[PDB]
């Protein structure tokens, strides 16, 4: 997160930390007590027994609940930047009760709408290209850019019906790397979307592009 704040206990309940062999590697959401959403490309491919989930901790390194995967499930539709949702099934089962919450989804077929507040977290960089990452969770609030602005940002094909974007036309407040898979919220804390993709971070008029909960629904309550 760039530009970002600290998160306070129970802003998340349901926001996990996914490490990789053992370093960070994306964030995700906790949708019911086996099952993690994620970015397809946060998991797509790669050996399913390198990655652990944490649950219940402003830090990804200690506290919580962890679990490593039993299964992975991208959307049927991935491709490129495309569709970029991932349904995780957890060997441990992750009870609600404490700072620990399953999340609340978008309606099917919500779109989230242009100049509303949206409040996305995570544990990536804090600047373009930076090597350190912090230790506890981060959020920032950017504005829902339209579909239109942002496929005048990107090309009119780059950014789907199942993207949204959020941003400041100035810059110096966005997702970036690491963030991936975790959730972008509105301002009723419902998530509406996973960090997936942009232009570099935090530029000005590059906005940060989002997967859709609302246009992905069916494919999340198939599986979860």
């Given at each position: 997160?760039?530009?970002?704040?600290?998160?306070?206990?129970?802003?998340?309940?349901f926001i996990v930390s996914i490490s990789?062999?053992?370093?960070?590697?994306?964030?995700?959401?906790?949708?019911?007590?086996?099952?993690?959403?994620?970015?397809?490309?946060?998991?797509?491919?790669?050996?399913?027994?390198?990655?652990?989930?944490?649950?219940?901790?402003?830090?990804?390194?200690?506290?919580?609940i962890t679990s490593s995967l039993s299964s992975v499930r991208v959307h049927p539709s991935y491709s490129g930047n495309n569709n970029d949702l991932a349904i995780l099934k957890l060997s441990t089962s992750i009870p609600s009760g404490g700072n620990i919450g399953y999340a609340r989804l978008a309606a099917s077929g919500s779109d989230p709408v242009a100049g509303s507040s949206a409040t996305v977290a995570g544990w990536g960089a804090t600047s373009e290209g930076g090597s350190s990452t912090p230790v506890n969770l981060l959020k920032v609030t950017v504005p829902i850019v339209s579909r239109a602005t942002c496929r005048a940002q990107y090309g009119t094909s780059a950014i789907t019906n199942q993207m949204f974007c959020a941003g400041v036309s100035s810059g110096g407040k966005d997702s970036c790397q690491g963030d991936s898979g975790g959730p972008i919220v509105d301002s009723s804390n419902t998530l509406i979307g996973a960090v997936s993709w942009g232009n570099g971070?935090?530029?000005?008029?590059?906005?940060?592009?989002?997967?859709?909960?609302?246009?992905?629904?069916?494919?999340?309550?198939?599986?979860a």
């Amino acid at each position: 997160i760039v530009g970002g704040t600290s998160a306070s206990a129970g802003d998340f309940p349901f926001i996990v930390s996914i490490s990789r062999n053992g370093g960070p590697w994306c964030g995700g959401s906790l949708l019911n007590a086996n099952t993690v959403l994620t970015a397809a490309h946060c998991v797509s491919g790669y050996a399913q027994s390198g990655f652990q989930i944490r649950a219940g901790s402003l830090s990804r390194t200690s506290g919580g609940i962890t679990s490593s995967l039993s299964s992975v499930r991208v959307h049927p539709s991935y491709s490129g930047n495309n569709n970029d949702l991932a349904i995780l099934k957890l060997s441990t089962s992750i009870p609600s009760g404490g700072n620990i919450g399953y999340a609340r989804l978008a309606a099917s077929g919500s779109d989230p709408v242009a100049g509303s507040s949206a409040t996305v977290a995570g544990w990536g960089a804090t600047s373009e290209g930076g090597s350190s990452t912090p230790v506890n969770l981060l959020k920032v609030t950017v504005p829902i850019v339209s579909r239109a602005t942002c496929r005048a940002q990107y090309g009119t094909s780059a950014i789907t019906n199942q993207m949204f974007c959020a941003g400041v036309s100035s810059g110096g407040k966005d997702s970036c790397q690491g963030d991936s898979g975790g959730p972008i919220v509105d301002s009723s804390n419902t998530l509406i979307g996973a960090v997936s993709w942009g232009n570099g971070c935090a530029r000005p008029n590059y906005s940060g592009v989002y997967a859709s909960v609302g246009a992905l629904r069916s494919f999340i309550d198939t599986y979860a």
